[PDB]
């Protein structure tokens, strides 16, 4: 499915950009349907909830008594619905801005945190804009300089910052976007290290044993006098057993 938008760098570098989705946690598209015994049917089943103030001997209430109360410390406060409809949060439509760039390769391999990854790709219709982005990425590709994009989908959507990795290949020239954490999702706690140990030192015969282990349990093999790696067992083409 095609996705159009407009990338901006600074004040006015508005370049119309198309984008597509990539690897996503795939799910089924059929609902288990409740069927009572003796009927083999559904429509003769009423499944419902009752709004029942217990607290006491019960007095069964209706739905127009409901303040969507929230927790605060040691009490529970109102502001059910229209108050948060007033003082909710907005971020004025869709946006694909650039915060800045970073020449350091300190965005590590372990902070990606995304339920989907994006390819901002090109545009269509006499793509001088996309050859401008080709110039952009053919400049960006030489050094470890990445982009920190702020992305949102609509006013219902939430804002999220993330990395835009370069991707220069044979037929396609892509930029691939992944999300990033906020400083509320990190947590960092102390661990006991193992290098300076008094009881957990392994000796050299055991070291050579695990060296023989990691030798003789390998999977990659090199040949044909060019030393490009031949590896079997590609866990990216193997189908998933569940839906099968």
């Amino acid at each position: 499915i095609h996705w159009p938008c407009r990338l901006t760098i600074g004040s006015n570098l508005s370049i119309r950009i198309a984008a597509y989705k990539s690897i996503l946690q795939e799910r089924v598209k059929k609902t288990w349907t409740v069927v009572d015994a003796k009927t083999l049917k559904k429509e003769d089943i009423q499944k419902e909830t009752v709004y029942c103030l217990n607290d006491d001997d019960e007095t069964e209430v209706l739905k127009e008594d409901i303040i969507q109360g929230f927790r605060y410390g040691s009490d529970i406060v109102p502001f059910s619905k229209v108050d948060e409809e007033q003082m909710k949060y907005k971020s004025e439509g869709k946006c694909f801005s650039v915060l800045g760039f970073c020449k350091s390769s300190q965005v590590q391999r372990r902070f990606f945190m995304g339920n989907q990854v994006l390819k901002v790709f090109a545009a269509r219709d006499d793509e001088a804009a996309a050859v401008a982005l080709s110039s952009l990425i053919h400049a960006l590709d030489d050094l470890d300089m990445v982009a920190i994009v702020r992305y949102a989908y609509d006013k219902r959507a939430n804002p999220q910052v993330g990395v835009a990795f370069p991707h220069i290949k044979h037929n396609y020239e892509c930029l691939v976007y992944v999300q990033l954490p906020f400083m509320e999702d990190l947590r960092q706690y102390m661990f006991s290290s193992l290098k300076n140990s008094k009881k957990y030192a392994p000796t050299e015969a055991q070291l050579n044993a695990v060296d023989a282990l990691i030798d003789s349990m390998s999977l990659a093999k090199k040949d044909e006098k060019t030393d490009t790696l031949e590896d079997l067992f590609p866990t990216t083409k193997i189908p998933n057993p569940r839906f099968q």
Binding site: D55, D56, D57
Partner: protein
Amino acid sequence: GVRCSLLRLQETLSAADRCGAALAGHQLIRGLGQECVLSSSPAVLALQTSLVFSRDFGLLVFVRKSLNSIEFRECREEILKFLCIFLEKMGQKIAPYSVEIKNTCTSVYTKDRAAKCKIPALDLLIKLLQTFRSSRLMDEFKIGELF
């Protein structure tokens, strides 16, 4: 010597410090469980079952009161598992004090949350209806609603 700790337990609960009322209630209910089972003279046993059973004050109204709390769990639990030894120190002579205990245990089940105390209510009902068999004394309890 009793009813001193009864009114002490009745009056110590209304103010704040809802752990002090819990510890005092534990001590005084232990006192009642010590000083009522020990007696054996039968008219004085009738005096005790006419002392702890009053329509204004007593254990039934005290456990009726502070159920809208969470701090009176240990004392209420001791009461509700003490009454299944008090239904076995005596017998079918308690029969004109029965339906109040049935309604007490029924509301205590359908009103509380924790099954540290929800099961002993069903213990008192499952002891009581096992005792008082199918007679005239089964028409007070509306079985058609209980089922």
